[PDB]
From Swiss-Prot:
<dbReference type="GO" id="GO:0005741">
    <property type="term" value="C:mitochondrial outer membrane"/>
</dbReference>
<keyword id="KW-0496">Mitochondrion</keyword>
<dbReference type="GO" id="GO:0006952">
    <property type="term" value="P:defense response"/>
</dbReference>
<dbReference type="GO" id="GO:0016462">
    <property type="term" value="F:pyrophosphatase activity"/>
</dbReference>
<protein>
    <recommendedName>
        <fullName>Inorganic pyrophosphatase TTM1</fullName>
        <ecNumber>3.6.1.1</ecNumber>
    </recommendedName>
</protein>
<feature type="domain" description="CYTH">
    <location>
        <begin position="229"/>
        <end position="391"/>
    </location>
</feature>
<dbReference type="GO" id="GO:0005524">
    <property type="term" value="F:ATP binding"/>
</dbReference>
<dbReference type="GO" id="GO:1900055">
    <property type="term" value="P:regulation of leaf senescence"/>
</dbReference>
<keyword id="KW-0809">Transit peptide</keyword>
<dbReference type="GO" id="GO:0016301">
    <property type="term" value="F:kinase activity"/>
</dbReference>
<keyword id="KW-1000">Mitochondrion outer membrane</keyword>
<keyword id="KW-0472">Membrane</keyword>
<keyword id="KW-0611">Plant defense</keyword>
<keyword id="KW-1133">Transmembrane helix</keyword>
<dbReference type="GO" id="GO:0004427">
    <property type="term" value="F:inorganic diphosphate phosphatase activity"/>
</dbReference>
<comment type="function">
    <text>Exhibits pyrophosphatase activity with stronger affinity for pyrophosphate (PPi), moderate affinity for ATP and ADP, and weak affinity for tripolyphosphate (PPPi). No activity observed toward uridine substrate. Positively regulates natural and dark-induced leaf senescence.</text>
</comment>
<keyword id="KW-0378">Hydrolase</keyword>
Amino acid sequence: DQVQLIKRKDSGRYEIVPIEDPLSFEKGFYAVIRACQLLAQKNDGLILVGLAGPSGAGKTIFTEKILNFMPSIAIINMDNYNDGTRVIDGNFDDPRLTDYDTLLDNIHGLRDGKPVQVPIYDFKSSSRIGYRTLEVPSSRIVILEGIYALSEKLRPLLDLRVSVTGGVHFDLVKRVLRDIQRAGQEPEEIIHQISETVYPMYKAFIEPDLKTAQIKILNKFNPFSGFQNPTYILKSSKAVTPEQMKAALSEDFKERTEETYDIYLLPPGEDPEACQSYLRMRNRDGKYNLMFEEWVTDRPFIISPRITFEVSVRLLGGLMALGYTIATILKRKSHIFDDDKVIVKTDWLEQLNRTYVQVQGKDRTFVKNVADQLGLEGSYVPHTYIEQIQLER
């Protein structure tokens, strides 16, 4: 866990000695920071670091923790370089989406001290809406975050190669194992087969690049952390109009609309309409998210950690190949007001032909008073949407 520098023979720049031992999320967080400090004191110019790893391993939350510790750094999200015309699919896992011509030009300009126009990608329209002007930051540290941030095209230009593995990405594999394990099976062999089925590109395209990392971080998923800081939800049957919400709420509440489609999956086996731990596949604005449905009911609140990570549609096929079955499909249209801390929204679900008001946020006191500000007392429904259709059979 001691960061040490060694001159790379291909140039005069120094490099981090590889740390073969995998490192914790907290320990790796400090190892990366101290490595950048030593690299900045011994090499001139841009300090470019590639943060690679699968979706859900925790590379996104890793970047935003470094940003909060050091606002002087800049984060470049490699998915903003996507070009949808290159593939006929819509899988974000695809390594053929990235426009390496724009990416390599941007980093070469930043190395020469020039500001560059880094693209901005909208997944809803699957197109490049525009560009943003990125200058070399004060700390001259730039983090390139993406699944293939350690690709062969980028490794020569990277100063530090960091990989993140595990997280909810691996926890799903263990969750599937809990659901489908049979007696006499060697658990590690099944885990390997689950990963091949549910993550059909990890072993081939993603993992080999991760092995070249100099700081290997293994984020162990904590089941108890989600309930420490969960999401508190109040659902109402009242008819609070979006016009009423706009006036009642502060001008800090941004207004937006969206359409979502949720696929509820049941584990294989015989759950007699009870003991049912659903897996939810959510489609929203060109992205698929897999959600764990772990709910508690403190009337009138319904509480859940809302653990989710981005997945491909291929994951749905893999889960069904492993015995998971589709219980129902819920299509809704929503009008959302977001304080960036508290969300007030109205959802219309086709299957119920009903409109409900939802106030959600991580601060329980904020959620309750905002619902009280809208006069929602006496109209609360302390049930999940999937539970409501079950109740209304």
